[PDB]
């Protein structure tokens, strides 16, 4: 286990045996792909192979090393104000949890229909000094599921978190990083959906119907200050203890809008990664 | 234990067995609620149920995960002065311990008559720079039970804490967080009270008679400085190792005054969460 796990030799690939010639009836190279199945032909079948003892692991080819990597999924920003502190909808952020709002990572998952996993988080506040001195600036990142008082403005009463989670980070102390189960509700996270809100010819339809894991509100405590600032508390997300069912084709066209699959540029007659050839005859 | 405790499967709910029809005498659906008791009827009784093996824990529905969550109960503030340092009743705070002075959390408890628990604390100083440089600012949070010298002003002699508790936090070092028993005196904390100070038709009456766990005085050491500041050392409180006896109806009307139950706006003809319907016939 150790060795196999430390040496990373858990999932090893078979070796290529030796072959000889075959002047025989059954032709393995011939199958009818229309059966929708996949051929099973190998080196040893087609050629006169040798003998190679392999030693490549398919460890890094696991839904956990494919998925289990932190990725920016959101960049909370706060261009502070000292003029009006508080006021309505100010100096405190509130973004809707769930990806899409960021590429790269979004594309990765989407490789599968369903999915499930405990999510590990990590914050990365970055205090830009627009003043001649910032000093001490406390921060409060408080998560909030659905039906919950979302702060109207900074100092509501919802920032008491009497029963909510609020992580605090003060300039100096390392980067906060917490985890989180598989939330949701049923069995796994809908990587898509072909359902709607209802029969209302004005109902919603997409992977935004089965995922509304509330919102997360920020807010920079410390109160009023002299020299201004602007913050950008980055967000990374990692999937630990992940699962997968049923795969699907990657996404070649640059996405559109949040949620949704839509493809459709502002003219860009549309565009994909495929390159053009002069002729099939020469590559 | 582990698994059950790590998997959080300690308090599990029964499953819903299978039923068949009943053309029989005893009618479980009929009971007389006037007995003040509660009905005992179930799915299996009323319908022709199936068979569902459950898997929901009532772990998070425990007075410890209901109560055991940190909540702002006080926000000590110090708008420093350099003009007059010391002076009487300045640059050092002194707030009366006990909730009420803050909602959310207050409402939570109040859900029960009595109660008891060791309290875990956490401070969150936030130094707002009103100057072109703060630097090093030491802090002294010193608790003080009853009959005790409460500092008249900053540098009394009571800040020697020869036999008191004073926690010290210097800009940089993480957030102080200490605990604390069940203090009080007898058995549990009076979540209410229907007693008075005495027969004096001018005596006190309320849950402020059985709870006077002294006061806590702050104070920012470091002495006189150049560039001003203002501090706001937040306060959070968590109940660990909590207990509960006898429950009661939640509080729908926005409180009034500290201590006391009083409801009674400045006209607000009074107000509660209930919404109005046009008709009972359609919901």
């Amino acid at each position: 286990n150790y060795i196999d796990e430390v040496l990373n030799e858990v999932l090893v690939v078979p070796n290529i045996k030796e072959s000889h010639h075959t002047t025989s009836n059954s032709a393995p190279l011939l199958d009818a792909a229309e059966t929708g199945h996949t051929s099973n032909v190998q080196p040893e079948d087609a050629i006169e192979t040798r003998y190679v003892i392999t030693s490549q692991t398919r460890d890094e080819m696991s839904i956990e090393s494919f998925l289990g990597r932190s990725g920016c999924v959101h960049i909370s920003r706060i261009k502070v104000d000292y003029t009006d502190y508080n006021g309505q909808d100010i100096n405190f952020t509130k973004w809707k949890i769930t990806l899409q709002e960021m590429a790269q990572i979004r594309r990765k998952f989407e490789l599968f229909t369903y999915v499930r996993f405990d999510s590990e988080i990590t914050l990365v506040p970055c205090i830009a000094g627009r003043g001649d001195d910032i000093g001490h600036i406390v921060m409060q990142y408080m998560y909030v599921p659905p039906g919950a008082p979302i702060p109207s403005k900074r100092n509501d009463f919802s920032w008491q978190s009497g029963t909510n989670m609020s992580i605090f980070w003060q300039h100096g102390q390392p980067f906060p990083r917490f985890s989180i189960p598989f939330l949701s509700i049923a069995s796994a996270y809908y990587m898509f959906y072909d359902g709607y809100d209802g029969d209302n010819t004005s109902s919603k339809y997409g992977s935004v119907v089965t995922n509304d894991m509330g919102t997360i509100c920020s807010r920079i405590v410390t109160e009023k200050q002299k020299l201004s600032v602007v913050i950008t508390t980055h967000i990374y997300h990692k999937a630990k203890h992940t699962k997968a069912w049923c795969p699907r084709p990657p996404r070649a066209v640059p996405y559109t809008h949040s949620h949704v699959t839509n493809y459709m540029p502002e003219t860009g007659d549309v565009t994909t990664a495929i390159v053009r050839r002069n002729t099939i005859t020469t590559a | 234990n582990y698994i059950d405790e790590v998997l959080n499967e300690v308090l599990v709910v029964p499953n819903i067995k299978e039923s068949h029809h009943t053309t029989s005498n005893s009618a479980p659906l009929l009971d007389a609620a006037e007995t003040g008791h509660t009905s005992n009827v179930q799915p299996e009784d009323a319908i022709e149920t199936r068979y569902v093996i459950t898997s929901q824990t009532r772990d998070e529905m425990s007075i410890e995960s209901f109560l055991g969550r940190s909540g702002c109960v006080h926000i000590s503030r110090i708008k420093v002065d350099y003009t007059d340092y010391n002076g009487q009743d300045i640059n050092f705070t002194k707030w009366k311990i006990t909730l009420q002075e803050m909602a959310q959390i207050r409402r939570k408890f109040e859900l029960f008559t009595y109660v008891r628990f060791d309290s875990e604390i956490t401070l969150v100083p936030c130094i707002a720079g009103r100057g072109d440089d703060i630097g090093h600012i030491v802090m002294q949070y010193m608790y003080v039970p009853p009959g005790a010298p409460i500092p008249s002003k900053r540098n009394d002699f009571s800040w020697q804490s020869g036999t008191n508790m004073s926690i010290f936090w210097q800009h940089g070092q993480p957030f102080p967080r200490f605990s604390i028993p069940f203090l009080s005196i007898a058995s549990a904390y009076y979540m209410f009270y229907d007693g008075y100070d005495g027969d004096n038709t001018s005596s006190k009456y309320g849950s402020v008679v059985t709870n006077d766990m002294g006061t806590i005085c702050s104070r920012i050491v470091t002495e006189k400085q150049k560039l001003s500041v203002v501090i706001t050392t937040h306060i959070y409180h968590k109940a660990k190792h909590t207990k509960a006896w006898c429950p009661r109806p939640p509080r729908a009307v926005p409180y009034t005054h500290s201590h006391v139950t009083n409801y009674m706006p400045e006209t607000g003809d009074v107000t509660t969460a209930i919404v109005r319907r046009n008709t009972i016939t359609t919901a």
């Binding site: 405990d118 985890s179 | 405790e5």
Partner: peptide, 19 residues
């Protein structure tokens, strides 16, 4: 060094294993 789930909950733990 391992299997020392310093934290209670399971959701908090390292990247799972392989089998």
């Amino acid at each position: 060094y391992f299997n020392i789930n310093y934290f209670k909950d399971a959701a908090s733990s390292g990247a799972s294993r392989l089998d």
